[PDB]
Structure formats: C-alpha cells, structure tokens
C-alpha cells in the first residue's frame, strides 16, 4: 500500500493538507466543501489500509486512488466540461489529461478579505477549517505552487493570526503580515512555475544544468560529485511536485533536507542556522541560504578547459560529465553571474567543442573560446546598467510605464491584461535589484526577468496570437531574455481603431484603490499604444498626462 507508506512518513495533519492541495490544483473550479469531503474519505481509507495492508484497494498507486475520488465529482460535465473527457480515460493517461488541464489563469473572484474581526472570530472558532480554506484558495489560483512550501506558508499564516488577534491594534498588526505573505506567495509561485516549465517543456537535462549552476554558486566548497548528488535528488523532488505526485515530493524533500544537514560540513558553512530548525523551516531556510565564501585557492579554468590537450578526449569520453564539470567550476567562482548567463556560456563551450574537435587542429581551434564569452557577459551587464539608470530617475511607476510602452510595441498582439501584469512585474525587478551593487545585480535582475518572462510564456501559450512570443518562448529556455530584448517593434502589425467598449469608464474610478487607478491608466496606455504603435515618447506623455488630468477634474466636479 503506497498510501500506507506515505501516511506513516507524513502523519495525518500534513497528509491531509497535501491531498487537499492536490485536489484543489486538479479541480480548480470545484467548491471547498466538496473537496474536504473527498479528502476525509481518502484519509480514512488510508487509515483502514494502515491496518490491513491488503484491504479493498490499498495495492493501488496514488494516481489511481486520487484519480477516482475526483472522478466522483468531475463527471458533472455541465460543471467542468473538458475535465470529464479525462475521467473517461484510463490510467496512467487519466492523470496526464488532468495535468494538461491545469489552468494558470483561472477565472476566479479576487479574494476580498473582510474586517479583522470577522477573520479573528472565524480563526478562533474553528482553526482547522480557517487554515484549510487558505490552503485551498492559494492552491486553486496557483496550480503549480510548490506543495511542501505551501505548508510552510500555512504555518506562517496561522502564526500571524495566533498573535495579531490577541494583540491591541489587530488591524495594524495583521494586514502587514498578510501583505508580506501575499507577495512572497506570488513570488514563490512564479519561481516554481519556471521550474515546472523547465522540466515539462525542455526536459530534465535542462533542469539539471540549471541546478548544477545554481548549487555550485551556492556551495563553492562542495565537491562536484556532491553537487551532482544534490542535483539528482532535487530533480526528482521537483519532477514529482510538478507532475502532481505531491506526497512523495514532500516526503522526498524531507530526506534531502535530512541528508544536507547531516553532511553540513562538506557542503556549506552557512546551513548552520537552517539545520537547527523544524522540518518546514529547515527545508525553506536551505533553499534560500546565501552563497558560501569562495574557496581561496582556485586555479584558472583555462588550465583544464582550454590549454589542456585532453579536452576533446574527455569531451568525447563522456560529454555530459565533462560539460557538467565545466559548469560547476565556472559557476562556483562566479556568484556575480546570473544562472542563465552561465548556461549560455556552457552552451557556447559545448558548441565550440563540437566543431573544434572535428577539425584536425583542435587545440588551435578552441584556443580562443573565452574571447567568445566576452560579448555574452557584457550584454546583460549593459542591459542592467541602462535599465537601472532609467529606473533610478523615473521611480517604479514611471519605469513600469516605460516598459509597458516598450513591450506593447514589441508584441502588440498580446492581450492587454497579460501585457499590463507582465510589465508591472518587469518593473518590480527594477525595485528589487537596482538596489544592490554591481556584484549582485546580474543574478538578481536576469534570473528574476526569466521568472517574469516565463509568466508571459505560459499565459500566452493558452491563447497564442504572437508568433514572435512563441518563437522567443520555445526556441531556447536560456536565451529567452536576450530574444525579447532584441525585439524592437513589430513592423507587420496593423493598428487597432477606436471602440469605447474596449475601455468602459464606469464612474467607479474615483472610488478604487490608488494602486487600482494606476492599473487603469496603464491599461489605457497599452490600448493607446495598440492604436498608435508609431506614436512617440513625446506624445505618449501628452496623452497620458491629459488623460490623468482628465480623470482628475472629472472625479472632482
Ligand atoms: O535567488 S535564488 O536562490 O536564485 O532563487 C531560487 C531559484 N531557484 C531556486 C531553487 C531552490 C532555492 C532557491 C532558488
Ligand atoms: O529587456 S528588458 O526586459 O526591458 O529588461 C528589463 C526589464 N526590467 C528590468 C529591470 C532591471 C534590469 C533590466 C530590465
């Protein structure tokens, strides 16, 4: 009984949380109550299997088991049309179909949170359901949220209430903590969405290269065979979480935190504070631990990778390992480079070897490969410098607007909401990274940009309208950012005419949150640029201002 095993390892509480998260991520439109019923029903079943490891159907894979309870509510086609086609399928296909149906932009009501009092009463009255509702709401809106970590957020959510409700000014104590949480949860969801996209659209080999680079940067002292071990386990974890095998992912993720803390000494002298913590805070702390100090006596890379004469042979013998070693070595000594840049470099090296080791004067051919790296390293450098400069002088809002204009002109066909969100996110990269000194700017900026452009790529892939987005999103995971940066203006784009129905003006615009005014004016700016692609940085201000001024007078007259 697979359930039995997982049950013993996670216990009842966490086991019940993971199953709810998994159902909420599969049937996103399904009501809360309905889910809870299925969960209990499944939990008890696991309980009867905990005793007689051969009852009714305890010798069934989780997929088989969960794929059945869901098909006892999804059958209702009038409710989840396509979902049903899935249940008519067999296994393991029955599972794939569901995964093909996860919705990155579920049409749902924005979670409005009542006054502090209503919440505190609800929390105090019944803690388990309050907590469960949170898990369900987050899970259905982010069908790829890293389950293990969602458990950690739930703990932080509980602790927020546990204290604010008891204190003097609850309002001022709760909101801040929940703001902090709403943001961090969106961030977390976006990063994980990139990991699943990597695994699902490009293959585990791409995910593995991403982890080697990232871990080597974080554990410069660790040994390649060690990093490689960590990378292999980490791959399985995410492979499972992304595929919906939430129980094993959580279970497997515990082991990794276990393993890493035991071997603390030979990995990083920074895990200390992480390892003397509870399970969930442990997993979490390790994932975000800062880079260790770089081993002081590290020989030039040129030695073993360009000057040596055994390059082609070692390459020939096992290119994967040799390429992995190149990345690990280059990465460990460049915590100042972004993970994607290191991957582009590793890609340039592999490409240079493929050609060079074919000619009969190898060493001479691949002798100046590091000169091919210079251009690749300064492009991101210039990009960041130029954009952080702009950011400093304009501030977040004005910067987001400049980006809205930039991107609408690049890919005008993209839906106004996606453009607005993506561009605001791109603007937050300016706020999060330009702060840092040049040494920490690139990993901050470019890896954050990869996360944000990944959103654009999954939102657009649902309803493709720009072959230019499609091309930049599917050609290569690592060159996405450079691909988008290179686009200027779509010259074949035919402008849109007018339509007052395109942008209603319901007076409810002097009543909405300040933040929501901006999002309205930005939604207007995008529509404006779509009508006048050729308009200019001069006239665009003229129509935005007057437009702002317009809503000013109007609102107070
Ligand atoms: O700032 S980063 O550390 O680069 O953010 C991260 C990206 N991918 C990650 C996987 C595990 C832990 C942290 C991660
Ligand atoms: O090619 S872009 O997407 O315009 O590059 C960028 C968008 N937002 C950024 C913030 C900081 C540095 C570079 C940025």
The 3-class secondary structure across 372-414, one letter per residue, is HHHHHHHHHHHHHHHHHHHHHHHHHHHHHHHHHHHHHHHCCCC
Taking a C-beta distance cutoff of 8 angstroms, is the pair 160, 181 a contact?
yes
> Determination method here?
X-ray
Determine if ligand 1 sits within 6 Å of the CB of residue 191: yes
Three-state secondary-structure class, residue 7? helix
Atom 5, ligand 1: residue with shortest CA distance: 288
Cis peptide before 78 (omega within 30 of 0): no
CATH of 1-103, one of 1.10.569.10, 2.40.50.140, 1.10.246.10, 1.10.3720.10: 1.10.246.10
The annotation status of 248 as a binding-site residue, yes or no, is yes
As a whole number of angstroms, the distance between CA 47 and CA 7 comes to: 8
Would you list the DSSP string of 185-210? HHHHHHHHHHHHHIIIII-HHHHHHH
Residue 167 to residues 160, 161, 171, 330, 508: CA-CA distances in angstroms? Answer: 11, 10, 10, 51, 35
As a whole number of angstroms, the distance between CA 204 and CA 210 comes to: 10
User: Distance from the CA of 331 to the center of ligand 1, in angstroms?
Assistant: 14
Q: Is the dihedral of CA 242, 243, 247, 251 positive or negative?
A: negative
As a whole number of angstroms, the distance between CA 446 and CA 337 comes to: 9
As a whole number of angstroms, the distance between CA 296 and CA 84 comes to: 60
| CATH code assigned to 104-193 | 1.10.246.10
The residues, ordered by sequence, that sit 6+ positions from 300 with a Cβ below 8 Å of its Cβ are: none
Three-state secondary-structure class, residue 299? coil
As a whole number of angstroms, the distance between CA 242 and CA 144 comes to: 7
| CATH code assigned to 293-378 | 1.10.246.10
The arrangement of secondary structure in 201-292, i.e. its CATH architecture, is Orthogonal Bundle (1.10)
Determine if ligand 2 sits within 6 Å of the CB of residue 14: no
Angle, alpha carbons 379-381-387 (nearest 5°): 100
Residue 246 to residues 62, 139, 149, 235: CA-CA distances in angstroms? Answer: 10, 12, 11, 14
Alpha helices in 27-167 (DSSP H): 32-51, 62-69, 81-87, 93-100, 116-125, 127-141, 147-164
Q: Which of 213, 287, 443, when mutated, tests ligand 1's pocket best, judged by the most ligand atoms within 8 Å of its CB?
A: 287
As a whole number of angstroms, the distance between CA 42 and CA 63 comes to: 12
As a whole number of angstroms, the distance between CA 406 and CA 400 comes to: 10
Determine if ligand 1 sits within 6 Å of the CB of residue 177: no
As a whole number of angstroms, the distance between CA 182 and CA 186 comes to: 6
Top-level class of domain 491-557: mainly alpha
Under DSSP, the state recorded for 495 is P
Question: Both tokens of residue 465?
Answer: 């309208």
Q: Do domains 201-292 and 379-490 have the same CATH topology?
A: yes
As a whole number of angstroms, the distance between CA 38 and CA 31 comes to: 11
Domain coordinates of the chain in residue numbers? 1-103, 104-193, 201-292, 293-378, 379-490, 491-557
Q: Which of 148, 188, 189, 191, when mutated, tests ligand 1's pocket best, judged by the most ligand atoms within 8 Å of its CB?
A: 191
The annotation status of 240 as a binding-site residue, yes or no, is yes
Which value in Å is the resolution of this experimental model?
2.2
Question: Both tokens of residue 164?
Answer: 């604010």
Taking a C-beta distance cutoff of 8 angstroms, is the pair 20, 39 a contact?
yes
Residue 131 to residues 34, 43, 120, 263: CA-CA distances in angstroms? Answer: 16, 18, 12, 35
Question: Both tokens of residue 52?
Answer: 């007689």
Given the structure tokens 């009255």, which residue do they identify? 125
As a whole number of angstroms, the distance between CA 414 and CA 463 comes to: 9
Given the structure tokens 């001479």, which residue do they identify? 364
As a whole number of angstroms, the distance between CA 523 and CA 422 comes to: 12
How many Å separate Cα 302 from the centre of its chain?
35
**Using only C-alpha atoms, what is the Rg of the chain?**
26
Q: Is the dihedral of CA 29, 32, 37, 38 positive or negative?
A: positive
Q: Which of 429, 447, 454, when mutated, tests ligand 2's pocket best, judged by the most ligand atoms within 8 Å of its CB?
A: 429
Determine if ligand 1 sits within 6 Å of the CB of residue 241: no
Euclidean distance between the first and the last CA atom of the chain, given in angstroms as a whole number? 71
The annotation status of 392 as a binding-site residue, yes or no, is no
Determine if ligand 2 sits within 6 Å of the CB of residue 387: yes
Main-chain phi, psi angles of 472, to 5 degrees: -65, -25
Determine if ligand 2 sits within 6 Å of the CB of residue 50: no
Question: Both tokens of residue 84?
Answer: 């049903």
Question: Both tokens of residue 34?
Answer: 């309905």
Given the structure tokens 């546990």, which residue do they identify? 162
Element (H, E) at 515: helix 514-531
CATH of 379-490, one of 1.10.3470.10, 1.10.246.10, 3.20.20.450, 1.20.1600.10: 1.10.246.10
Question: Both tokens of residue 541?
Answer: 């201000």
Taking a C-beta distance cutoff of 8 angstroms, is the pair 446, 340 a contact?
yes
As a whole number of angstroms, the distance between CA 22 and CA 10 comes to: 15
Question: Both tokens of residue 496?
Answer: 């849109």
Atom 7, ligand 2: residue with shortest CA distance: 426
Angle, alpha carbons 258-260-263 (nearest 5°): 110
């Amino acid at each position: 009984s697979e359930v039995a095993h997982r049950f013993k390892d996670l216990g009842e509480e966490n086991f019940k949380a993971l199953v709810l998260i998994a159902f909420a991520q599969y049937l996103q439109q399904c009501p809360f109550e309905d889910h809870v019923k299925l969960v209990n029903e499944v939990t008890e079943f696991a309980k009867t299997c905990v005793a007689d490891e051969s009852a009714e159907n305890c010798d069934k894979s989780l997929h088989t088991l969960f794929g059945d309870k869901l098909c006892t509510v999804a059958t209702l086609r009038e409710t989840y049309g396509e979902m049903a086609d899935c249940c008519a399928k067999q296994e393991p296909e029955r599972n794939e179909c569901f995964l093909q149906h996860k919705d990155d932009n579920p049409n749902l009501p924005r979670l409005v949170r009542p006054e502090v009092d209503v919440m505190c009463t609800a929390f105090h009255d019944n803690e388990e359901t309050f907590l469960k509702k949170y898990l369900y709401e987050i899970a259905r809106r982010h069908p790829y949220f890293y389950a293990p970590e969602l458990l950690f957020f739930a703990k932080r959510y509980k602790a927020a209430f546990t204290e604010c409700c008891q204190a003097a000014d609850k309002a001022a104590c709760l909101l801040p903590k929940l703001d902090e949480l709403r943001d961090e949860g969106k961030a977390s969801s976006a990063k994980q969405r990139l990991k699943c996209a990597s695994l699902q659209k490009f293959g585990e080999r791409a995910f593995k290269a991403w982890a080697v680079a990232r871990l080597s940067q974080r554990f410069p002292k660790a040994e390649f065979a060690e990093v490689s071990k960590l990378v292999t386990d980490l791959t399985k974890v995410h492979t499972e979480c992304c595929h919906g095998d939430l129980l094993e992912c959580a279970d497997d993720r515990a082991d990794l935190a276990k393993y890493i803390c035991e071997n603390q000494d030979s990995i990083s002298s920074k895990l200390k504070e992480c390892c003397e913590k509870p399970l969930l805070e442990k997993s979490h702390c390790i994932a975000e631990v800062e880079n260790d100090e770089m081993p002081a006596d590290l020989p030039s890379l040129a030695a073993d990778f360009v000057e040596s004469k055994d390059v082609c042979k070692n390459y020939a013998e096992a290119k994967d390992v040799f390429l992995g070693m190149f990345l690990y070595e280059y990465a460990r000594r460049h915590p100042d480079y972004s993970v994607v840049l290191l991957l582009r470099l590793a890609k340039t090296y592999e490409t240079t070897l493929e050609k060079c080791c074919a000619a009969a004067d190898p060493h001479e051919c691949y002798a100046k490969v590091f000169d091919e790296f210079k251009p690749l390293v300064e492009e991101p450098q210039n990009l960041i410098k130029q954009n952080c400069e702009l950011f400093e002088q304009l501030g977040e809002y004005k910067f987001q607007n400049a980006l809205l204009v930039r991107y609408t002109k690049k890919v005008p066909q993209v839906s106004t909401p996606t453009l607005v969100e993506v561009s605001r996110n791109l603007g937050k990269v300016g706020s999060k990274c330009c702060k840092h000194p040049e040494a920490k700017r690139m990993p901050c900026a470019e890896d954050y940009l990869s996360v944000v452009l990944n959103q654009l790529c999954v939102l657009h892939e649902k309803t493709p309208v720009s072959d230019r987005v499609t091309k930049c999103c599917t050609e290569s995971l690592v060159n996405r950012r450079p691909c988008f940066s290179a686009l200027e203006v779509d010259e074949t784009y035919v402008p849109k005419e007018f339509n007052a129905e395109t942008f209603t003006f319901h007076a409810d615009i002097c009543t909405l949150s300040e933040k929501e005014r901006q999002i309205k004016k930005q939604t207007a700016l995008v529509e404006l640029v779509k009508h006048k692609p050729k308009a200019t940085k001069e006239q665009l201000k003229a129509v935005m201002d007057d437009f702002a001024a317009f809503v000013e007078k109007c609102c107070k007259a």
